[PDB]
Assembly symmetry: C3
Homo-oligomer: 235 residues x 3
């Protein structure tokens, strides 16, 4: 469920769920994790771009088919582990990582995007974190967003549950760039070439230092979040 192509030293991973909105099914997680592993392990690769695809959403979050079909505690507990593992998978890529966002980045897709070093979105795209509106728990989201963007910003976002257009994302500093849908991928690749040109020894050790507290946060959130979602999933 992911294409892997190359713009020279740049590896481009394109999400390809049967569904245009690239929902994170368990199969898609797997592919995305595996592609990231290969990219990180491959010396020909010096930078990575993850992309929803032309006329496709970055990801509309997890698979509503998994989520709505969750009752057992065993089942929910392990689902949270999966989710974090995915986010960690991105954070542990020792090379530069760009997220090219078009369409919708919702809930899990929003969060997934926040794991990247940089984010460019289309002028026509949207971010959303509408969990509580819908009756889903959002401790993991709160945790991430609080860490990346501050307490009061996070509060606003998760409690308002609004559809964030580009102007709004810029205002929140959720993205580094806004371009036309047609221009988006090339723009992302360029950013990747730029960061790829920074000496590797320097960039890897710095990125590691930078992402350590983030990883550590996510690990701490693991247990407590299993608690809210176990309790929430009974309606």
């Amino acid at each position: 469920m992911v294409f892997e192509e190359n713009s020279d030293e740049v590896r481009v991973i394109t999400l390809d769920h049967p569904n245009k909105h690239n929902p994170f099914s368990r199969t898609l997680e797997t592919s995305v994790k595996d592609a990231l592993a290969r990219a990180n392990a491959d010396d020909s690769v010096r930078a990575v771009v993850v992309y929803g695809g032309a006329e496709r959403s970055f990801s509309a979050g997890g698979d509503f088919n998994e989520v709505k079909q969750l009752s057992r505690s065993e089942d929910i507990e392990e689902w949270i582990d999966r989710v974090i593992d995915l986010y960690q998978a991105v954070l542990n890529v020792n090379k530069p990582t760009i997220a090219a966002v078009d369409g919708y980045a919702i809930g899990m897709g929003f969060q997934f995007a926040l794991m990247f070093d940089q984010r460019l979105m289309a002028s026509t795209a949207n971010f959303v974190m509408p969990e509580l509106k819908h009756g889903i728990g959002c401790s993991v989201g709160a945790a991430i967003l609080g860490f990346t963007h501050g307490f009061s910003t996070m509060q606003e976002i998760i409690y308002q549950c609004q559809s964030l257009d580009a102007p709004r994302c810029v205002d929140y500093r959720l993205v580094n760039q806004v371009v036309e849908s047609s221009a988006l991928l090339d723009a992302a690749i360029t950013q990747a070439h730029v960061m790829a040109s920074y000496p590797a020894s320097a960039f890897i050790n710095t990125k590691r230092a930078v992402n350590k507290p983030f990883i550590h946060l996510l690990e701490q959130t693991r247990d407590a979040s299993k608690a809210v979602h176990k309790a929430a999933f009974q309606a």
Copy 2:
């Protein structure tokens, strides 16, 4: 010193100190805490709005003369503890909380407001944190504001001691909305109805998770602000 009213599932707590600027006296603390307890314990309540009242300040905070008048240290311990307990009282409300700010939100009033889930202010209102200007210590304000809005933002506010009108609060992201004084209360209630419509269990457990570090911070600050006036 409050009015408790209802817009259906929304409880509206209106501060009513004899003084139009709703200063936090001991008595007002008490009422506000008790009204919050009831609202949180009441089934019929699904969201809470706290409001200074029409043609009234949200709250000018606590008397700096009386703060400066405390010279026994348990006087200060008692007082520090009271202040935090108030802020914790808000943070422990398991339902949505909106603060409708008109007039002045000063010192304690500024801080008290930061405990809420959301904040709307009037176009004509002002936030201020002037403690250092008036020769008051300011650990608790800094601690809170650093946590809610970042180090460098807090630095600027505390050290500059300026009256922050609405444009400035928006720029700082201190509020979620600015409206006319006449429109403010209805606006706040609407927000409350919106958040009240969120499936409770999912909301409550999330809010608990969210506010936990905040509460823990207030506890750390309690100990520290009293290690100060002890040495």
Copy 3:
């Protein structure tokens, strides 16, 4: 390598490296630390302004040819310890501190500036954190910047390695004011007089509380950054 003047209760420390870009050589660090010590220890001083000088940079930081030289594990460590000690030196000044920025504030100069209570820059000045562009490690810069201004802001800055002019710094909230180069020093001194007029008890204890987490973070970053500038 520093000239110490007085505007009444305000002490003004002007960086004076032979090089007009005030690079942080070991000698300059020393002078700056010693001038800060004296200013903090001097009762006649109630506030401090640090300035690059007219027609001179605040500081272009350390020399990236020398940094890339350091291969011996001691050399790396002692250098890191020095760098932090400098930043701590500013944080431990118990009186108000203003940084008057003209020219370039690069890497160490950017970071050094973030230690101050307030920052004014010239309209014509620039901030830069270009370490990764030039193959220099940046754990320290990121640690600081993440703490002062948030994770995602720090990310953007260190990964983009751009020259931030004034409009951009305002947009990032890196400074409290932008003025003409000619006006800059007087502006800084005024800010210093303003903060100097706040009661010393009130200020000193608050500032201590405020800067504690910052110091504690610098101390962690020290122990850590060794292992990465090592590898």
